[PDB]
């Protein structure tokens, strides 16, 4: 029976080599595909994969679980782990070690994580995990706004002043409460002054003055 192997894997997870726990859990997953613990084994594999940095498999296991369990009393746990699973792909230990700011790299993973956490928060407002998901969403909203800042800054050095104006306007429509927009606004004022569009530059100057502190 799965009793002893599963309990051993649980002790290995609490303290021990996660790879042995994974080997045992995979053996149980193949030996008892439909047993009473099959769901718990799948949830434990999802956790073990996350903890061991085997993210491609945590994603495959989550999608498999969702297909098999479109409704489940603890599906909000699965969604929360999905959000962490995708946010974990943004970081890089080597870039971290030297203190390099990764904000300019591909942001598609942050948007996927954001969507997963938004669905978690909106679907189950009473879940015990919404406090952490809220902190994740606040951090990620700036993670995404900063990328647009970096592109807007790059274009002022080449002189693509139309791209600068539209890029910052887009930022202003989507991220009205982040630090990146408050810092970006002078880029728009300059873009509207290198072109002879003073009527709009004065509007920007009034916006800057109104929000100055």
């Amino acid at each position: 029976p799965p009793n002893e192997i599963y309990a051993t894997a649980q002790q290995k997870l609490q303290d021990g080599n996660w790879r042995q726990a994974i080997t045992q859990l995979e053996a149980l997953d193949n030996r008892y595909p439909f047993g009473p613990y099959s769901q718990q084994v799948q949830l434990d594999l999802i956790y073990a994969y996350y903890k061991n940095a085997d993210l491609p498999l945590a994603q495959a296991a989550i999608d498999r679980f969702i297909r098999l369990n479109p409704t489940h009393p603890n599906i909000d746990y699965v969604m929360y782990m999905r959000g962490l699973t995708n946010m974990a792909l943004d970081d890089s230990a080597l870039q971290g070690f030297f203190g390099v700011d990764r904000s300019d790299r591909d942001p598609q993973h942050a948007r996927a994580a954001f969507s997963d956490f938004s669905k978690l928060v909106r679907g189950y407002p009473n879940s015990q995990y919404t406090t952490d998901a809220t902190k994740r969403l606040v951090f990620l909203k700036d993670r995404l706004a900063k990328y647009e800042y970096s592109v807007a800054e790059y274009y002022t050095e080449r002189g693509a002043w139309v791209a600068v104006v539209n890029r910052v306007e887009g930022m202003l429509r989507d991220y009205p409460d982040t630090q990146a927009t408050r810092d970006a606004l002078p880029l728009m004022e300059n873009a509207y002054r290198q072109m002879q569009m003073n009527a709009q530059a004065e509007k920007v100057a009034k916006i800057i003055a109104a929000n100055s502190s």
């Binding site: 693509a160 002043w161 139309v162 539209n166 306007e169 429509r173 072109m195 569009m197 509007k203 916006i207």
Partner: protein
């Protein structure tokens, strides 16, 4: 003596030509203007219903070439004013 360093030619804004701007008249709808000239790339997002049409070129380390057209519409979508700067000054 940076004049010898190669710089790719830069184009900015929508295209404009006399054959198209000479067709604009007060009384056209926004759909008629958008059809005649194409989708604006710049507008005032701060509540003024106006479009900015800008033709800018800086080839060959030459002087800046720009033609500017500003179109002012009322709240109903009807064009009320045309302001056309043929050159920078």
């Amino acid at each position: 003596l940076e004049r010898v360093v190669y710089r790719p030619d830069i184009n900015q804004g929508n295209y404009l030509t006399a054959n198209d701007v000479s067709k604009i008249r007060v009384g056209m709808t926004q759909q008629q203007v958008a059809y005649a000239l194409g989708t604006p790339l710049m507008s005032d997002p701060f509540g003024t219903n106006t479009w900015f049409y800008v033709f800018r070129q800086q080839p060959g380390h030459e002087g800046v070439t720009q033609q500017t057209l500003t179109l002012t519409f009322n709240s109903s979508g009807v064009l009320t004013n045309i302001d056309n700067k043929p050159a920078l000054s």
